[PDB]
Amino acid sequence: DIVADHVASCGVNLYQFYGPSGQYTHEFDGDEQFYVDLERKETAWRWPEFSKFGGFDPQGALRNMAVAKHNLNIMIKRYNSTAATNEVPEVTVFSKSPVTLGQPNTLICLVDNIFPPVVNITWLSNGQSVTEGVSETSFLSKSDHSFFKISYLTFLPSADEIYDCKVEHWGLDQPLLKHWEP
Amino acid sequence: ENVEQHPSTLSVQEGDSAVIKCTYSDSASNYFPWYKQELGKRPQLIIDIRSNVGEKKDQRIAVTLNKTAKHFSLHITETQPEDSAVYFCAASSFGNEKLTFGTGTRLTIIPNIQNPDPAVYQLRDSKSSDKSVCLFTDFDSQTNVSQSKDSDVYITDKCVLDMRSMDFKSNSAVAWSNKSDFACANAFNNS
Amino acid sequence: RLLMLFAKDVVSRNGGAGVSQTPSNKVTEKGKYVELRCDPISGHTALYWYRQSLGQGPEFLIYFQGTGAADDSGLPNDRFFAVRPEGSVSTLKIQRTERGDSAVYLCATSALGDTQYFGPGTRLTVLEDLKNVFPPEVAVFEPSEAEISHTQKATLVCLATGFYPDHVELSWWVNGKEVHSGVCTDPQPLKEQPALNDSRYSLSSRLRVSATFWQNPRNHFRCQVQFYGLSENDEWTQDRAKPVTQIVSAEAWGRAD
Amino acid sequence: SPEDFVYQFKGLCYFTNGTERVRGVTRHIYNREEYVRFDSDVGVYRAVTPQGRPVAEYWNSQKEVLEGARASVDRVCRHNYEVAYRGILQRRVEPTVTISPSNLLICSVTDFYPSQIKVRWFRNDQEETAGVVSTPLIRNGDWTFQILVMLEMTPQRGDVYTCHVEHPSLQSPITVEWRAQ
Ligand SMILES: *[C@@H]1O[C@H](CO)[C@@H](O)[C@H](O)[C@H]1NC(C)=O
Secondary structure, three states: OOOOOOOOEEEEEEEEEOOEEEEEEEEEEOEEEEEEEOOOOOOOOOOOOOOOEEOOHHHHHHHHHHHHHHHHHHHHHHHHOOOOOOOOEEEEEEOOOOOOOOOOEEEEEEEEEEEEOOOOOEEOEEEEEEOHHHHHHEEEOOOOEEEEEEEEEEEEOOOOEEEEEEEEEOOOOOOOOEEOOO | OOOOEOOEEEEEEOOOOEEEEEOOOOOOOOEEEEEEEOOOOOEEEEEEEEEOOOOOEEEEEEEEEEEEOEEEEEOOOOOOHHHEEEEEEEEOOOOOOOEEOOOOEEEEEEEOOOOOOOEEEEEOOOOOOOOOOEEEOOOOOOOOOOOOOOOOOOEEEOEEEEEOOOOOOEEEEEEEEEEOOOOOOHOOOOO | OOOOOOOOOOOOOOOOOOEEEHHHHEEEEEOOOEEEOOOOOOOOOOOEEEEOOOOHHHHHHEEOOOOEEEEEOOOOOOOOEOOOOOOOOOEEEOOOOOHHEEEEEEEEEEOOOOOOOOOOEEEEEEEEEOOOOOOOOOEEOOOOOHHHHHHHHHEEEEEEEEEOOOOOOOEEEEEEEEEEEEEEEEEOOOOOOOOOOOOEEEEEEEEEHHHHHHOOOOOOEEEEEEEOOEEEOOOOOOOOOOOOEEEEEEEEEEOOO | OOOOOOOEEEEEEEEOOOOOOOEEEEEEEEEOOOEEEEEEOOOEEEOOOHHHHHHHHHHOOOHHHHHHHHHHHHHHHHHHHHHHHHOOOOOOOOOOEEEEEEEEEEEEEEHHHHHHHEEEEEEEEOOOOEEEEEEEOOEOOOOOEEEEEEEEEOOOOOOOOEEEOOOOOOOEEEEEEEEEO
């Protein structure tokens, strides 16, 4: 246990054999400053107000993705090809701010204890798929080296719409719905 | 991105110092190596400098760096002919480790010839060769050797040899032909 | 203007003292497949491949971190591909070869990635046909008596003539050891007829020994010109000997008084 | 289900008391298991597991790797504090305090940053503790927290309730009243 006022991750470097795929992010005190888009080779900010402090050469990431790609192969061998244990994620659904009908708000779907980092998170409005007003965080890191991820639905709380968050995972026998109604 | 390098070609007297200037664009560049390349060989890493120092010295060689003006150069003092090569500056950054090179400087150190004694000798025919060969040797490095104005005789440019257990250096140029009236007398030039 | 840094990952382990490439020269014709090998400085985790169109400086092709590609942005087209299956040796494969691919292919490696040490490079020489590949004729010419008397030194001259494409490696051997002391080869060969894209090349060299050395009949001089041509297996259907990669050499022994 | 294998490599910087005590750690993880760690307080690569013993052995002998990991704290950690972290630590977002009944009264302090918050409940200018429950800080995942602090109340005509909030972004506390209808 390391005591500190603050802690950055100047590089969470995620690489997995399934895909294969990767992710490169920096985090300051639990929050994602930026990510690197590995297909596009382009640094990207989910929350643009943070470009203001710190650019980043996409090349630095693609570099470490190469190393991880190499090292994962080494480490697979040493561990006798020991496949990752699927975890059972904890979904919870809550609002950003207090609920007032007619007041625009953002719904927050929190998927904790994600492992491995493979999850489809969609929203449902009256049991139908919503694509409008949905956005995500990247896979955020945890000291037990599992991940969490957070999807957002912006919405107009109405007389009747009923919302669900649909989470799909390999630790889940069947797509898991979490409900939220005004 | 890009790195610009001047001059294009440089001739300096043995002894004098030589200077190549370079300039880079990406302000993030943190590492700046220089390479020497002899003909038919790869670039040889001779000195490098990082953006936390302004100057580095290594024997006859010196490298400088202005991170605010993005200039960096190479100083070769007390030049010796072995120094004759193509030199390259390159630049690298912390996240992008590939080197991006300059267009090359072709260094030529003109060898100071101590006691010139310019003479033209003839060499003895090979049993297996229909040609005759003349050797122009022992001349001052300033001396001109012009190319053949006759299709049937071939004349090479000058070249410095050492040997290298004495304090001896010499230039030479070879003329050869199979033309019946080939006189070593005067295939060359002048005062 | 302002960038943050990061923790660089390092390769896990689970070559020679310098970076080697062989051969120095690969000579082929259009449309054929060419591989360029490169054995890294042993222990070096990062390998780079650069291309040098002669006249200009090196330009980046691909960068390996261990077994995997960190940066492939420099590969000129989809006919280029590079591998490094054991994170050690790396081969560069060029698929359907065109004249425009003619360059020297440098290889450089690094312990971690930053500081790069190059190899001697492989010059790929891609031609229309192989109909003009001729190996050299080598001839040595023994020293002027007049030079020997005047300067008490003896200059021998080697002449490699009649070869195409250019680029041969000329060495002087004396009593079974290569020599560099007293030697100077032309820095550039010359066209035997400059008015042609089809011209063949000549090249001279000089070895200069002391008179006593030349005058000792036990001293054996050889002038060796290495030539890069077609390999043993390559089709050849022309009225003349197959211009294989081969050494051509001429000799002289020292002569008394 | 598809079989997967996972590699994580984290470079972490721990700061304390400005930039006085700084501490760099790197973890190399296979699935959920850190197998080899470099820790600027230890000074060298340590194996956390059996599988990390030879990797750390090797790296520790390479003068250049060891030295690079040692410089990391000053070259990377201390640099990022200057480039980003210091300005991020300047970031102040004010909490929105709102009271609503669900006999339970829910003070909902929302949208704030940084994380440090005090929240107190009152009944008639007298602090109520016995009847308070709070959530942990909740992380919104944008750059804000929120927190819900409940007072268990038995409302009477006359009574004034006050949710009282202190946060680094506020020069003075926010108070929000709720009068028994
Ligand atoms: C923080 O560090 C400074 C000097 O770096 C020191 O003066 C100050 O007392 C320190 N504060 C604490 C709480 O350690």
